[PDB]
Amino acid sequence: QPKLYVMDNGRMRMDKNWMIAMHNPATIANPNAPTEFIEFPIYTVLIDHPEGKILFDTSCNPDSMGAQGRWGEATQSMFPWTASEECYLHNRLEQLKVRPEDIKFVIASHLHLDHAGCLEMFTNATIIVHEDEFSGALQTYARNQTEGAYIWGDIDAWIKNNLNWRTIKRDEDNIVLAEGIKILNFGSGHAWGMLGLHVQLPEKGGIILASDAVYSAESYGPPIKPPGIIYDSLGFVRSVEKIKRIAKETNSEVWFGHDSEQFKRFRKSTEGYYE
Amino acid sequence: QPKLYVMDNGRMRMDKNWMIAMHNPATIANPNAPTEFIEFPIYTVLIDHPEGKILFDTSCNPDSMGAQGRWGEATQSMFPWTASEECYLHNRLEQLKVRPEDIKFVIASHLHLDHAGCLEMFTNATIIVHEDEFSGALQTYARNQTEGAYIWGDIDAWIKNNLNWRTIKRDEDNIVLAEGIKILNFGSGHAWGMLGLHVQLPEKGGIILASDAVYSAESYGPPIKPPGIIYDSLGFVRSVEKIKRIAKETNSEVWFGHDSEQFKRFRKSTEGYYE
Numbered sequence: 001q002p003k004l005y006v007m008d009n010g011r012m013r014m015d016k017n018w019m020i021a022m023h024n025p026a027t028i029a030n031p032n033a034p035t036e037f038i039e040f041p042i043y044t045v046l047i048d049h050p051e052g053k054i055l056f057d058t059s060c061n062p063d064s065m066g067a068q069g070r071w072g073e074a075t076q077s078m079f080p081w082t083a084s085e086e087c088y089l090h091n092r093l094e095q096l097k098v099r100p101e102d103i104k105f106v107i108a109s110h111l112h113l114d115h116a117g118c119l120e121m122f123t124n125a126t127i128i129v130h131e132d133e134f135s136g137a138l139q140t141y142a143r144n145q146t147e148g149a150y151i152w153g154d155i156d157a158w159i160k161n162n163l164n165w166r167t168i169k170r171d172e173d174n175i176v177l178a179e180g181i182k183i184l185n186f187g188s189g190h191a192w193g194m195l196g197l198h199v200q201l202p203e204k205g206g207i208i209l210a211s212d213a214v215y216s217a218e219s220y221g222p223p224i225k226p227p228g229i230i231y232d233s234l235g236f237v238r239s240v241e242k243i244k245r246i247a248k249e250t251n252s253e254v255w256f257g258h259d260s261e262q263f264k265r266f267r268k269s270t271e272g273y274y275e
Numbered sequence: 276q277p278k279l280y281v282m283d284n285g286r287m288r289m290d291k292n293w294m295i296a297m298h299n300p301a302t303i304a305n306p307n308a309p310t311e312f313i314e315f316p317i318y319t320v321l322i323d324h325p326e327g328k329i330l331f332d333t334s335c336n337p338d339s340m341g342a343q344g345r346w347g348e349a350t351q352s353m354f355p356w357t358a359s360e361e362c363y364l365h366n367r368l369e370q371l372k373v374r375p376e377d378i379k380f381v382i383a384s385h386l387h388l389d390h391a392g393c394l395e396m397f398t399n400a401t402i403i404v405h406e407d408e409f410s411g412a413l414q415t416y417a418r419n420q421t422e423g424a425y426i427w428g429d430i431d432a433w434i435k436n437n438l439n440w441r442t443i444k445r446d447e448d449n450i451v452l453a454e455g456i457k458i459l460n461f462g463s464g465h466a467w468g469m470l471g472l473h474v475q476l477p478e479k480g481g482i483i484l485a486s487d488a489v490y491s492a493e494s495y496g497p498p499i500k501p502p503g504i505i506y507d508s509l510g511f512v513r514s515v516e517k518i519k520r521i522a523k524e525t526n527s528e529v530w531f532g533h534d535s536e537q538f539k540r541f542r543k544s545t546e547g548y549y550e
C-alpha cells in the first residue's frame with residue numbers, strides 16, 4: 001500500500017508581484033505603491049510505492065546560495081532561499097532511510113532553480129521531464145546565462161553526471177507510471193513544459209500535484225490570477241482550467257506549488273505520511 | 276500626395292509595471308521596492324489621402340473620467356486620463372477642418388478604452404477591426420461589466436449608432452486600403468486581435484503604426500520586455516518580432532503606442548504634418 005511523504009525543503013522569498021501579477025497597482029492616491037517580499041515553502045514529495053519509489057520535484061541545490069553559490073548574484077537577491085541542513089533534500093531522504101539510488105523515477109515538474117536543483121543526485125533513476133522544458137533549459141546553458149531561473153551550474157552537473165532522461169513528448173498525456181500514479185502533461189504556461197502528478201491513495205483518495213502550474217490558492221481563484229512573468233499566458237490559464245476539471249472529475253485535492261497556508265497544514269515527513 | 280497628422284489626445288498615468296513587467300523587483304536590499312506612476316501620451320493618426328481620409332485609432336471618450344463617467348471607479352484610479360478640451364478627438368479633427376463624416380476608414384488597432392473611445396462619432400466610415408477583438412469586446416458587453424479595459428458605455432454607443440463594421444479575418448494580412456496604406460494583422464497578443472498600419476509617404480518613407488503591440492522603445496528592446504499583464508504572451512513576442520522584420524525589410528520607422536520621448540519628437544497636428 002503506498003505511502004506519500006511531504007518533505008520540507010526550506011523557504012524562499014520574492015516580490016509578491018512574481019506570484020500574483022499586479023497584485024497592488026499604483027493609483028492616484030498611492031503612486032509609489034510599495035510591494036511586499038513574501039515567503040513561501042519549497043517542498044518535494046516522495047511516494048513509496050510497491051512498484052518503486054517515485055520522487056516529485058527536487059527542491060534547490062545545497063550549493064545554490066552564498067559566496068560560492070551557483071545562483072547568480074541578482075538571482076540570489078531576488079529569490080533568496082533559506083534552508084537549514086536538515087531541509088536539504090539529501091538529508092530529508094536520509095531521515096526517511098531512502099538512498100538516492102533507491103529512487104526509480106524522478107518527475108521534474110519543470111527545470112526551474114527551485115524544482116530541479118538536486119536532479120544531479122539521482123544517477124540511477126529515470127528522470128522524467130517535458131521535452132520542450134529540456135530543450136529550453138539546455139539552450140540557456142549553451143548561451144552561458146549566469147542569471148535567471150535556469151541555473152547554469154545545476155545544468156552543468158546534470159550533464160556531467162550522465163542522467164537517464166526520459167522526455168515526455170508534447171502530445172503525450174496521462175502517463176501511467178504505476179498503479180494509481182499518473183503524470184499529467186500541462187504543457188507550456190508557467191514555463192516551456194509543465195508536468196504534474198495525479199496520485200490515487202487508498203485512504204486519502206486523489207491528489208493532484210500542480211507544482212508551479214498553480215502557485216497558490218490565490219492563483220487558483222476564481223478568479224484565476226496569473227504570475228507576474230509568464231512564458232505562455234494562454235497556456236497558463238488553460239492549464240489551471242485543466243487542473244480544475246481533473247480535480248472535479250476525480251474528486252481530487254489540488255496541492256499548490258508554494259501556498260504557505262496549505263503547506264502549514266500538511267503532515268510532513270518528520271511526523272508521518274499520507275496513505 | 277498624402278499628408279499624415281499626429282493628433283495629441285492627452286495623457287494617461289499608470290503603474291509602470293503595467294507597461295514593463297517586473298521593471299523593479301523587490302530584493303533583499305529593497306524588500307518593498309516602490310513602483311512609479313508614469314505618464315504617457317494618448318494619440319491618433321489621420322492620413323489625408325487622395326483616395327479618402329483614414330483615421331488610425333480614436334483615443335478615449337470625452338465622458339470617460341469623473342464620478343459620473345463611463346469608466347469604472349477602479350479603472351479611473353489606476354489609469355487616469357487627463358485631457359484639455361483641445362485634446363478631444365472631435366476638437367482635434369475640427370482644428371484640421373475634418374468632419375467625422377469625412378472619414379472613409381477608421382482602423383481600430385484594438386477595442387481598449389484608450390483606442391476605441393470615439394468610434395461612435397464615425398457613423399459614415401467603414402470601421403476596420405480584427406474579428407476576434409470584435410467578438411471579445413462584444414462578449415464583455417453582453418456580460419454588463421463596470422470595470423476593465425473594455426468600456427460598456429463605449430460599446431453600447433457603437434451598437435446604438437449602427438457603425439459600418441468590416442472585420443479582418445484572423446488569417447487575413449497585408450490588406451491594402453489605398454495606395455501606400457496597408458493594414459498589418461498582428462493577431463492575438465496584447466489583446467484578442469491587434470491591427471497596425473504601414474504607411475508609405477513620398478518624402479518621409481515608411482512608417483509602421485504599432486499601437487499597443489509595442490508600448491514603448493523600452494518594450495521594443497532588445498531585449499523585448501512584455502507588459503505586466505499580457506493576454507497572449509507568446510503572441511505578444513511573435514508580434515514584436517513581426518514588426519521588427521517588416522521594419523527592416525521595408526526600411527520603416529516604428530511608431531509606438533505610448534512612448535513619451537518619441538511622441539515629444541513628433542510634429543503634432545497644430546504645428547504641421549508629415550509627407
Ligand SMILES: CCCCCC(=O)N[C@H]1CCOC1=O
Binds near residue numbers: 018113114212258
Ligand atoms: C527571472 C524570472 C524567474 C521567474 C520564475 C521563477 O523561477 N519563479 C520561482 C519562484 C517559485 O517558483 C519558481 O520557479
Ligand SMILES: CCCCCC(=O)N[C@H]1CCOC1=O
Binds near residue numbers: 388389423424487532
Ligand atoms: C486591466 C487590463 C489592462 C489591459 C491593458 C490596457 O488596456 N492597457 C492600456 C494602457 C495604454 O494602452 C492600453 O490599452
Ligand SMILES: [Co+2]
Binds near residue numbers: 190191
Ligand atoms: Co517555476
Ligand SMILES: [Co+2]
Binds near residue numbers: 112
Ligand atoms: Co516553484
Ligand SMILES: [Co+2]
Binds near residue numbers: 385387465466487
Ligand atoms: Co490596449
Ligand SMILES: [Co+2]
Binds near residue numbers: 532533
Ligand atoms: Co494603449
